[PDB]
Nucleic acid binder design. Sequence first.
DNA 1: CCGACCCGCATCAGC
DNA 2: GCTGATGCGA
DNA 3: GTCGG
Length: 320
Amino acid sequence: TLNGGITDMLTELANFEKNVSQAIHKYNAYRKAASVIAKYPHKIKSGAEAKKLPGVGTKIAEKIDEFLATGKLRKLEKIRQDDTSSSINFLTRVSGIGPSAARKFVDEGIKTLEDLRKNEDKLNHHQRIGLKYFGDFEKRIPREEMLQMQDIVLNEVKKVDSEYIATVCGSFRRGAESSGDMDVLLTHPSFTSESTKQPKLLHQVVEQLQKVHFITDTLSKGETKFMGVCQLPSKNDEKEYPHRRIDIRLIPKDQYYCGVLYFTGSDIFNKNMRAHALEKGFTINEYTIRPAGEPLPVDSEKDIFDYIQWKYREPKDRSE
DNA sequence: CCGACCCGCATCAGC
DNA sequence: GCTGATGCGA
DNA sequence: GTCGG
Ligand SMILES: [Mn+2]
Ligand SMILES: [Mn+2]
Ligand code: NA
């Protein structure tokens, strides 16, 4: 329920705008109208009614009519049948395949996972992992596993250096009963915004997690960001836990809190809070919040909230 | 009528 | 080689 | 797509 009929239709319209139309802003517009209609409390019984809401303009209001009147969106119907667009859309679901490669692949007739597997040369490194773990990466990871996942990371990071500070942020920090990836925030004293008193700080952590057979594959690895694959150690004659995504960020200690607010999200919430900082006369990024002038001081997450006249929303409520 | 819409890493285009 | 643009995903 | 200059 919950105007679910509309919000699906919108969300579906959005995924076709990103993946097929490569119209990133129409995608955002649709998801937006969707997240708003989702908060509206009433059963929308009219396009005009929905048009009262912000984010709902005419076109979406037109579409709500066709939907409410026919239980169907003839555009969406056509799109779902369409071999080309159905494929470009599907392949996006492989990490490393955005809309741009999706369309290359379908142009050359590559349209399925089977077609991808027997085209391994035509896949860069990332897309080859994305295929190899296509299943696992769409599986949700239970909080019970998030915890097992947390222990290993905190345990191994301190084994490298007792001065590191590692914080699982993301859906996890928001109490969510299950999460998609493992987002992890990392800080060390040598790395500050002012200076980099030690190198390989991220590397060390990655190699250690890789030494203990926790991190199994790398998608992208820089000085300050890691994107990777990891796997709980299993038991004897027992099923192998699924392969899971993990993102590690090395934030300057001085900007720790601007990084927490950011890696905690949510993404809809983040753009919702960033878009309110601009109108309140501010710019908020994972490092700083600026007036764009000099770095405003920060020693709490709420500090950022008051700056834009926002009541502090406990991490559990930033699920927008 | 029209422009705006909230950064790190890999790969590629081009010099 | 190098820089800068683009894709992709946080 | 939607909104505001
Ligand atoms: Mn996450
Ligand atoms: Mn993530
Ligand atoms: Na993808």
